[PDB]
Design a protein around this ligand. Structure first.
Ligand SMILES: Nc1ncnc2c1ncn2[C@@H]1O[C@H](COP(=O)(O)OP(=O)(O)OP(=O)(O)O)[C@@H](O)[C@H]1O
Ligand SMILES: [Cl-]
Ligand SMILES: [Cl-]
Ligand SMILES: [K+]
Ligand SMILES: [K+]
Ligand SMILES: [K+]
Ligand SMILES: [Mg+2]
Length: 378
């Protein structure tokens, strides 16, 4: 093609291409190495990625996200029914299949999850093509290891709809392991633990690898734990702060909250590299600006319980895999949230000082491995 590797995440998607013995994680039009898995519909246009997320605060009802939580599932599924209660967009039942319903150009329209995901994939495909200056057709698309046949089929379909020839659908943890060359033959079997804390989900997977063959020994985690929850803790903290300083509660102003959240998410990223971050919002509420700051220590305390809780699934995964900590040959960090220093400390401490594989940007590791595999299969 060359063939590309695409990591379709619940919050962000990433595309990479292997060329000249090296993987290139491709930046988008805005120079971002990952793209929001968002799609929006307006009176005049369909927006995807950065353009869609950049307007979610003003168009919550027609801005779709979390299609990954619906893909391949039935409308009557317990989790689907539960998730619906939290989404600002409508999810309808079409013969037992869930579809997101939105307004586009003044008319009501509905899309299957795979159609929404195909839109995101199309964006990733175009991002790769702009970089390569060539048409991209072949691709390896990844999915959470626990995905069933239906979810895998629907994901492949999303690719096909986008004009991609899906060479293979592979597990995210396996892609991560491949990124670090853990698939190479070294004689005996090796146990690898993948600690994946993304934007909306937490996945711990223990893989056993031998002769280039992967076996998913166990999986654990929380489908509703991720970076967004950390942003939430910060949002609540600042709503309280604004209330103290201005005797005004911004909680019911959906837009103000979303704008504060965006500022929090950015502040959070800064706290992974610096011990303090500044938040400066204009016209947050009733023309009142919100200029303040937060320390790394403060950020850690606001999320202490959530951070510490990530170790429970690690213990469970080990137990289910019938392995002691000492039997894990490698620990691979995946997901943007694993860039948080406190998370790395907790995991490393749990593993008695064992070093973590974190040289590859965690939020790019899956796409990196998928790109390598795509090359191999091409
Ligand atoms: N430097 C950073 N420090 C802390 N968090 C970060 C950093 N960079 C990105 N993140 C967070 O990582 C999350 C995105 O991670 P990633 O791109 O792995 O998500 P994803 O694959 O869509 O998630 P999931 O697999 O849970 O669906 C967001 O919550 C983002 O705020
Ligand atoms: Cl773009
Ligand atoms: Cl600690
Ligand atoms: K992703
Ligand atoms: K994840
Ligand atoms: K997941
Ligand atoms: Mg992910």
């Amino acid at each position: 093609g060359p063939a590309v590797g695409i990591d379709l995440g619940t919050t962000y998607s990433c595309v990479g291409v292997f060329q000249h013995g090296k993987v290139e994680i491709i930046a988008n039009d805005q120079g971002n190495r990952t793209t929001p898995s968002y799609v929006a519909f307006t009176d005049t246009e369909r927006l995807i990625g950065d353009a869609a997320k950049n307007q979610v605060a003003m168009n919550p009802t027609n801005t779709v996200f979390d299609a990954e939580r619906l893909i391949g599932r039935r409308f009557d599924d317990a989790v689907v029914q539960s998730d619906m209660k939290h989404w600002p967009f409508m999810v309808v039942n079409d013969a037992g299949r869930p579809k997101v319903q939105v307004e586009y150009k003044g008319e009501t329209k509905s899309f299957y999850p795979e159609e929404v995901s195909s839109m995101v994939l199309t964006k990733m495909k175009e991002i790769a093509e702009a970089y390569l200056g060539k048409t991209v057709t072949n691709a390896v698309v990844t999915v959470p290891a626990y995905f069933n046949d239906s979810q895998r089929q629907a994901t492949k379909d999303a690719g096909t709809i986008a004009g991609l020839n899906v060479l293979r659908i592979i597990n995210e943890p396996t892609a991560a392991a491949i990124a670090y060359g853990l698939d190479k033959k070294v004689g005996a079997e090796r146990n690898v633990l993948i600690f994946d804390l993304g934007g909306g989900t937490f996945d711990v997977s223990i893989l056993t690898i031998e002769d280039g063959i992967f076996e998913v020994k166990s999986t654990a985690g929380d489908t509703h734990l991720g970076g967004e929850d950390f942003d939430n803790r910060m949002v609540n903290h600042f709503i309280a702060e604004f209330k103290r300083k201005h005797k005004k509660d911004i909680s019911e102003n959906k837009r103000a909250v979303r704008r504060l959240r965006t500022a929090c998410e950015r502040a959070k990223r800064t706290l992974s590299s610096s011990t303090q971050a500044s938040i400066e919002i204009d016209s947050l509420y009733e023309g009142i600006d919100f200029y303040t700051s937060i320390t790394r220590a403060r950020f850690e305390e606001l999320n202490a319980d959530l951070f510490r809780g990530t170790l429970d699934p690690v213990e469970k995964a080990l137990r289910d895999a019938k392995l002691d900590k000492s039997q894990i040959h490698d620990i691979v960090l995946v997901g943007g949230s694993t860039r948080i220093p406190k998370i790395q400390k907790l995991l490393q401490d749990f593993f008695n000082g064992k070093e973590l594989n974190k040289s590859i940007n965690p939020d790019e590791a899956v796409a990196y491995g998928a790109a390598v595999q795509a090359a191999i299969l091409s």
